[PDB]
């Protein structure tokens, strides 16, 4: 199945030249679906949610212009064929959503990210 669309993300895309891109697309759409309730609660909007795979291996995600574009690494940085665990990707997704509000990695940022991580778990547990 195609995951239910998230009203708060306008478009998702994945890297078309990578192996198992069909899998990758299902994965980023499942991420989008799973965070839909949290985004509604926090009035978060994202225009583009897309996959990237930077040479810089420490790079896992990025937020361009407070949600205009969020980029997520979906694949292991030492093996293109292997996808990162859903838990890891969701963690990065919540990190980048926090940057819709807060730029620097200061107390405001970490406090908010901690609230989002906590709340997202409860949302999933209850299937909201
Ligand atoms: Zn950050």
In contact, 108 and 102? CB cutoff 8 Å = yes
Distance (Å) from CA 1 to ligand 1 centroid: 32
Token digits of residue 44: 């978060």
Closest to 73 measured CA to CA, from 10, 18, 2, 35: 18
Residue 87 structural domain? 1-128
The Cα-based distances of 91 to 31, 97, 121, 125 in angstroms read 10, 10, 11, 16
Closest to 60 measured CA to CA, from 46, 45, 43, 77: 77
Q: Which value in Å is the resolution of this experimental model?
A: 1.8
Distance (Å) from CA 67 to ligand 1 centroid: 13
Residues 6+ positions from 61 with CB-CB distance below 8 Å:
70, 71, 72, 73, 92, 93, 95, 96
**For the chain, how many structural domains are there in total?**
1
Just list the catalytic residues: 96
CA distance 41 to 51: 25
Elucidation method = X-ray
Distance (Å) from CA 60 to ligand 1 centroid: 10
């Amino acid at each position: 199945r195609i995951p239910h669309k998230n009203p708060h993300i306008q478009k998702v895309a994945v890297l078309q030249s990578k192996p198992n891109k069909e899998d990758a697309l299902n994965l980023i759409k499942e991420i989008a679906h799973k965070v839909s309730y949290l985004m509604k609660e926090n009035h978060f909007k994202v225009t583009n949610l897309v996959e990237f795979y930077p040479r810089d291996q420490r790079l896992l995600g990025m937020n361009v212009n407070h949600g205009s574009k969020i980029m997520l690494r979906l694949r292991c940085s030492t093996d293109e064929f292997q996808f990162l665990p859903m838990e890891c990707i969701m963690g990065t997704m919540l990190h980048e959503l926090t940057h819709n509000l807060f730029g620097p990695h200061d107390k405001k940022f970490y406090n908010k990210l901690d609230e989002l991580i906590g709340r997202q778990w409860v949302i999933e547990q209850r299937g909201l």
